[PDB]
């Protein structure tokens, strides 16, 4: 389970998500990476999945995000679709709903997703030769 291809599915969507630099991607999420980091792999997954579910739930219809042009709206819909898919994959790896997130610091979503991408690529690296 630890080195499952879900890791690739997550990294793919993080690569898609981090091309985006929009008003929406500068809105914030609770920075799970501001912890002095006392957490199992499964608990980190649960934490990331929680904050991202909060984000897409709160911003799927946010007028700062929805866009004026066709391209902006398309990019918003893509952002939300990729966040939901990333989130489904993170939950599947968490095996866990019960991970209280208590950090104060807020990160932009862009910075949070880049950090998560680094973490996931590191896990991938530790799985492979």
Numbering used by the authors: 1 to 129
Sentences from the paper on this structure:
Analysis of the variants T13D and F82D yielded dissociation constants KD of 0.02 – 0.04 nM and 0.03 – 0.04 nM respectively. The increase in affinity is mainly attributable to the reduced dissociation rates (koff) of T13D and F82D. The structures of the IL-4 variants T13D (max. resolution 1.65 Å), F82D (max. resolution 1.7Å) and T13D-F82D (max. resolution 1.8Å) were refined on the basis of the structure of wild-type IL-4 (max. resolution 1.8Å); all crystals were obtained under identical conditions, allowing detailed comparison. In the variant T13D, the aspartate residue resides in the middle of the first α-helix αA, and the side chain is oriented towards α-helix C. Both carboxylate oxygens of Asp13 are involved in a bi-dentate salt bridge to Arg85 on helix αc, thereby tightly fixing the side chain of Arg85. The geometries and distances of the bi-dentate hydrogen bonds are close to ideal parameters; the planes formed by the carboxylate of Asp13 and the guanidinium group of Arg85 are out of planarity by just 14°; the lengths of the two hydrogen bonds are 2.7 and 2.8Å. The χ1 torsion angle of Arg85 is in the trans conformation (174° IL-4, 176° IL-4 T13D) for both proteins; in the case of IL-4, χ2 of Arg85 is slightly off trans (160°), whereas for T13D, the torsion angle χ2 of Arg85 is in the trans conformation (176°). In contrast, the χ3 torsion angle differs by 115° between IL-4 (58°, gauche- conformation) and T13D (-57°, gauche+ conformation). Modelling of the interaction of T13D bound to IL-4Rα suggests that the guanidinium group of Arg85 (T13D) now forms bi-dentate hydrogen bonds with the main chain carbonyl of the receptor Asp125. In contrast to the hydrogen-bonding network of Arg85 in wild-type IL-4, Arg85 in the complex of T13D:IL-4Rα is probably also fixed to Asp13 (T13D) via a bi-dentate salt bridge. This internal hydrogen bonding would result in fixation of the Arg85 side chain prior to complex formation.
